[PDB]
Design a protein around this nucleic acid. Structure first.
Ligand code: FES
Ligand SMILES: [K+]
Ligand SMILES: [K+]
Ligand SMILES: [K+]
Ligand SMILES: [K+]
Ligand SMILES: [K+]
Ligand SMILES: [Mg+2]
Ligand SMILES: [Mg+2]
Ligand SMILES: [Mg+2]
Ligand SMILES: [Mg+2]
Ligand SMILES: [Mg+2]
Ligand SMILES: [Mg+2]
Ligand SMILES: [Mg+2]
Ligand SMILES: [Mg+2]
Ligand SMILES: [Mg+2]
Ligand SMILES: [Mg+2]
Ligand SMILES: [Mg+2]
Ligand SMILES: [Mg+2]
Ligand SMILES: [Mg+2]
Ligand SMILES: [Mg+2]
Ligand SMILES: [Mg+2]
Ligand SMILES: [Mg+2]
Ligand SMILES: [Mg+2]
Ligand SMILES: [Mg+2]
Ligand SMILES: [Mg+2]
Ligand SMILES: [Mg+2]
Ligand SMILES: [Mg+2]
Ligand SMILES: [Mg+2]
Ligand SMILES: [Mg+2]
Ligand SMILES: [Mg+2]
Ligand SMILES: [Mg+2]
Ligand SMILES: [Mg+2]
Lengths: 164, 108, 45
RNA sequence: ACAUUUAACUAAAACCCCUACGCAUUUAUAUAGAGGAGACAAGUCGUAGUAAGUGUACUGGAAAGUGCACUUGGAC
RNA sequence: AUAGGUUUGGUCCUAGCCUUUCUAUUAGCUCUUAGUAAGAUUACACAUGCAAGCAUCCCCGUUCCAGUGAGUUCACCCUCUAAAUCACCACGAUCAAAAGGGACAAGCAUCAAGCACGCAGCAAUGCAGCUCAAAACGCUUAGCCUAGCCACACCCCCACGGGAAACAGCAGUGAUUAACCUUUAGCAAUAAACGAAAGUUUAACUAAGCUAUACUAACCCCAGGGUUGGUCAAUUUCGUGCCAGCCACCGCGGUCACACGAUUAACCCAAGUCAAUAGAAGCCGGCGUAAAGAGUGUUUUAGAUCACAAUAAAGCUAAAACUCACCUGAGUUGUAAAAAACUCCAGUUGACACAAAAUAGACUACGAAAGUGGCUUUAACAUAUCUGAACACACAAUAGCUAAGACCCAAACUGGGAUUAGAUACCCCACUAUGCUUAGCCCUAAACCUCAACAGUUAAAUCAACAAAACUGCUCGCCAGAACACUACGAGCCACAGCUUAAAACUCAAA
């Protein structure tokens, strides 16, 4: 079987289940947590289960972790403007931390839908080209248009050999 | 191995495949230097028709002549393909019948 | 006979070491070795 | 190493240097000679006590043996 | 992989090799028509003809298109900002160099150190730094991430200069390779250049020529190639007789050969077939006995969640030896039986170690391991997370080597005694190195509980086998068929035919 505890964490489906897409302001995220102590328990799970998803959805955001440097667990976000956002996570569950960070620094669903609609415009359906970019290669694939000579030989009258 | 060790070592690195007597080519042209016969290794017994040839690469190699009856002499041009002769140790090349000087096996 | 071969190999190793050391100061621009420098014989007791 | 001239009632002309590479350095090929690995060759070839080991060290009456330590993957 | 064949007398396990599938090139044999796509092996040398003009002179273009894959992290993103197009009064958009920041192929660590590779200051100058086992530096391989991009344009990276006289433009040729397209037409379309424009030019391109390389469709007559022991669909008769020959693996052939050759029949695919070659598809599995836990411990950068018989010193000695002395005796030793040897021999008694430590111990302790078992005393047995190294730092039985010393006993070697018919290597006697102490080396063991360290469980189907009940979490180390090979080369070491690390070629179908 897959090595380690909770191997589901190392699947692309789980990594893509993350729901936090940070705004463009967030550059760095430091996660200070304690290996022991019940009060930081949720924070530990946040490191165990949710940091991979956050990083997968935010590849260009620096995420760095620190252990047993302060009595309490906390998150700090550094923004492009120089503003710093501190989120105390002691006594919180990892779901609460995820929801809080999504609320305060995550792109809302409307902005994500707008981005998806903007993406859709790039792949214009009417454009003809390679399958890698277009639905169809050539107009010959459209029903009712003159078909490709590979499949249907063209009548003798429209071919240059018998027009010359 | 642990996940850290697998990450450190990285993906398996398959050794490069070994080039055979033909040096990864379908066939090779050769000039016959001398003809002789060799005896099989034993589960068997025979007098296998073989010939030494200088290949186009310049190396000299022993090749097997298949079929009943051949008319190969010195200085003749042959085409040799791959495929080991299982009975003859060290003979990994076979002459192509019906190409250049080596003619097809005569009927009956 | 392995003594002769081995000592010849040790001599060649010393020569290679000296050649590399010379390469360095030649590339650095110094026409000669560093003032007072003498390559030690490290491969012979 | 090497150098600011002419010209100027509209404005222009003129411009140009000499030195390296070797008995240095890298790798490769060829050649004298020496040495290993595999191939238990094919037959109209031939035949009716000292337990095991691992390290070392020695052997000039060596068809194998001995000294020291250790192991049971022996016996009692 | 829905797997299959093959190790053995047999079973199970492990493990390699091969089969079945899909493409590409070449070869054999065989090939009818039509449409489409694709089309030197070679950055080797090239005969010949064309491939760049336009235009009232200036300019503009010929820096493009077309070609090749030699070299090879120049291609991508961001910042800044030229040239170019359009605004063309610029405001600025588009496009895109140079420069700055980041990203960016494969194999080899037996390429492990690079050798000036950094910083600060206006400068003078000062500091000594910078990269690197999370792979620097180095060697080798390859065009790439394909609406396309990068690099090159005969060579000297470059091209002032030199070699020297250039098809990697189209057609074509020579040589070379297994590899082999016409020395056609037209600018009618699109694109490019030029022109104010009608237009002109273009081996780009368009339309044709050749070729089973491929796709699609067809055919009145027209089917070939391979295969038929198993894997794997399918053999009648003869011929041959371990020969001739055949096989991808296992294998067949010695007078009944479904395995060779011919013939008959059958099977698969089919204008193809399938012989060779090359790709397509690889470790989330293991390490007591199959390859793999490398003798012991510590820690670094990090990762994880488990937060009384030790050893060094000093002293000391109860038995038994050796040596010396008196008294006594003529023999003592030696063994299956003897001979040599000793008779400065032997017995009692007394004195007397730099050697070794009965009994306790039927105990199972101490120490990281190696090891440690006579008595006394002095020092003394790390760490309040865990893991953490062939190489760093400290240790490692026995054997072996330098200097000095001690020598009872034992004892490799060396002599002698005794022995068959080439004796006993083996028994007996004598005596070395060595076993001991001091100061240094060497660094090997069946260094083994043949069980890596920590933490946890006993519920599950307990569980290939045997060994030692079966497992889980986490970390480090190690392993990917056999042999070559506890090897060669490289490197390191107080080691000098020594130790550690450790391959490749040829070979095999197993081990
Ligand atoms: S691809 Fe459209 S006519 Fe062929
Ligand atoms: K013009
Ligand atoms: K290339
Ligand atoms: K060049
Ligand atoms: K035209
Ligand atoms: K043991
Ligand atoms: Mg032991
Ligand atoms: Mg198998
Ligand atoms: Mg068998
Ligand atoms: Mg063919
Ligand atoms: Mg500009
Ligand atoms: Mg640039
Ligand atoms: Mg090497
Ligand atoms: Mg390493
Ligand atoms: Mg290349
Ligand atoms: Mg050039
Ligand atoms: Mg040409
Ligand atoms: Mg040329
Ligand atoms: Mg071809
Ligand atoms: Mg023309
Ligand atoms: Mg054509
Ligand atoms: Mg047959
Ligand atoms: Mg083993
Ligand atoms: Mg062990
Ligand atoms: Mg530790
Ligand atoms: Mg290591
Ligand atoms: Mg030792
Ligand atoms: Mg000693
Ligand atoms: Mg002695
Ligand atoms: Mg360990
Ligand atoms: Mg092997
Ligand atoms: Mg060695």
């Amino acid at each position: 079987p897959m090595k380690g505890r909770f191997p589901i964490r190392r699947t692309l489906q789980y990594l893509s289940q993350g729901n936090v897409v940070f705004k463009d302001s967030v550059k760095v995220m430091t996660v200070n947590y304690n290996t022991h102590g019940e009060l930081g328990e949720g924070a530990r799970k946040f490191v165990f289960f949710n940091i991979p998803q956050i990083q997968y959805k935010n590849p260009w955001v620096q995420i760095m972790m620190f252990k047993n440097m302060t009595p309490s667990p906390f998150l700090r976000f550094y923004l492009d403007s120089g503003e710093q956002v501190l989120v105390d996570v002691e006594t919180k569950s990892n779901k609460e931390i995820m929801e809080h960070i999504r609320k305060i620094l995550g792109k809302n669903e409307e902005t994500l839908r707008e981005e998806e609609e903007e993406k859709k415009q790039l792949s214009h359906p009417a454009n003809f080209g390679p399958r890698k970019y277009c639905l169809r290669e050539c107009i010959c694939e459209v029903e009712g248009q003159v078909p490709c000579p590979s499949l249907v030989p063209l009548p003798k009258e429209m071919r240059g050999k018998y027009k010359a | 191995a642990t996940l850290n060790q697998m990450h450190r070592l990285g993906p398996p690195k398959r050794p490069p495949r070994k080039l055979g007597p033909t040096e990864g080519r379908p066939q090779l042209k050769g000039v016959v230097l001398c003809t002789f016969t060799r005896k099989p290794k034993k589960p068997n017994s025979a007098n296998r028709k073989c010939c030494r040839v200088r290949l186009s690469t310049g190396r000299e190699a022993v090749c097997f002549i298949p079929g009943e009856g051949h008319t190969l002499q010195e200085h003749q041009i042959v085409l040799v393909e791959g495929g080991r002769t299982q009975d003859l140790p060290g003979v990994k090349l076979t002459v192509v019948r019906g190409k250049y000087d080596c003619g097809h096996v005569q009927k009956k | 006979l392995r003594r002769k071969v081995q000592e010849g190999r040790l001599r060649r190793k010393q020569i290679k070491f000296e050649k590399d050391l010379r390469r360095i100061w030649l590339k650095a621009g110094l026409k000669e070795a560093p003032e007072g420098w003498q390559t030690p014989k490290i491969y012979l007791r």
